[PDB]
Amino acid sequence: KNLVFQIGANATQQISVNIEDMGADALGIKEADGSIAALHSVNDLDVTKFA
C-alpha cells in the first residue's frame, strides 16, 4: 500500500513512498524480535532490571 504520488501529466510518472514506525520501532530483521528489539522502545528495561 505505497504512497503513490502523481507527479506527471501522463501514465506511470509517479513516485512510490513507504514509511513505518511506532512503539515497536527498535531493531528488526523481518519483524522486530521478541524479548529484544521492540520493547527496547516500548518497555525499556530499567525497572529493576539492570541491578
Binding site: 503513490v4 504520488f5 502523481q6
Partner: peptide
C-alpha cells in the same frame, strides 16, 4: 483524474 490519482494526499 490526475489529482484524484495523487493518492497519498
Amino acid at each position: 483524474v490526475v489529482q484524484a490519482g495523487n493518492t497519498g494526499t
